[PDB]
Paper text:
The binding of the plant phytohormone Abscisic acid (ABA) to the family of ABA receptors (PYR/PYL/RCAR) triggers plant responses to abiotic stress. In the resting state, the PYR/PYL receptors are monomers or dimers and display a wide empty ABA binding cavity flanked by two highly conserved loops, named as gate loop and latch loop. To investigate this issue, we have selected as a model SlPYL1 which is a tomato dimeric receptor with known structure that is involved in the induction of stress responsive genes and drought tolerance. Interestingly, the analysis of the structure of SlPYL1 shows that Glu 151 is not involved in the dimerization interface or interacting with ABA; rather, it is located in the latch loop.
Residue numbers in the entry:
A (entry chain A), B (entry chain A): 29 to 219
Amino acid sequence: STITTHHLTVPPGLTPEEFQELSSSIAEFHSYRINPGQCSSLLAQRIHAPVETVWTVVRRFDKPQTYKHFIKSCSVGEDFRMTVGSTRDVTVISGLPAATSTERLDILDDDRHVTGFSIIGGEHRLRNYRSVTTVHGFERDGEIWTVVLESYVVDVPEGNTEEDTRLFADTVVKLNLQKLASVTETLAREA
Amino acid sequence: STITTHHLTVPPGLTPEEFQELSSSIAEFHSYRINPGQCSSLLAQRIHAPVETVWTVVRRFDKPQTYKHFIKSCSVGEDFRMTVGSTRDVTVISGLPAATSTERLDILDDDRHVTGFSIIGGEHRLRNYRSVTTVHGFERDGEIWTVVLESYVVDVPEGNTEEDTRLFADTVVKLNLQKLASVTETLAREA
Ligand SMILES: O=C(O)c1cccnc1
Ligand SMILES: O=C(O)c1cccnc1
């Protein structure tokens, strides 16, 4: 059992100067105690849009399809409210027969721009998956931009190397963060 | 048994005027006779780069990782030459235990900018997968751009709707074409 070290390495796609401004947030929100058989990763994405524009999309637990790829549909309860412990049923585009991943909302902090979720049923390739996404505003000489950080911890299935699990989860997260950027930059450029 | 009708519908992300310039090419290269239990799709991507810049990337059968997502590695023979009937072994990022998809190069026409491949082993979700990619130059008042068209035909696995198979294959193709655009536009803007 160890503690992750995401707060001591510059995540790809981030400047060292950006990283050093984010160190405390990475320690607070993007650290995990990991056991053997588990792996963890931290991904970053710079977005040329204001923080609240990005957050408004990131915080919509009931509409992951807005920025995530491979979502066929997302269903929530009839009296769903955006509250910790609530769940969503996501239908992922797998090439396999129709199914659903049940996901639990773990964190929602509208003041600090933190959210996170856990996969609690369905996707057997990501058993014990848990992620946290945070949104951060930057300013330099009157210019503003945003950085989104997303980390996860996950169990490595029996009969898989860590390096294959990480490579799948990283690719999904990185692609989703790219879509988040395009979606919110379009919104920023247009609105 | 029917003939696909990709040449009579405007593919998403294409203007009707672009489509009507491409009708003959869609009929020649992006038509398939499909049997029940099979589905087919045509995808388009506009790229702001010259045709040969895009083609140089599209034609590299031995380096699909340059524009495709989820590729861990690609291996070809020791005396591999870029010739029809040649194969490549691609390791796809599945979240599942390491494996390989064997893919056959079906077409290569450097004069008409046509290529295509078939999956001939591995990916059981895409049995009988076959695609064709063509690259087309456009000009308007001295401005030039490119359009890439990619179609496939594939068997729908037992225990799957067509709509789930198509949605997976379409998402993969569309995402790959997006990467192709970014890769080649970067190359065009920079070089
Ligand atoms: O955020 C998700 O839904 C996700 C991330 C990594 C892998 N699979 C799913
Ligand atoms: O082009 C590919 O490699 C591909 C396209 C669709 C689905 N799976 C793979």
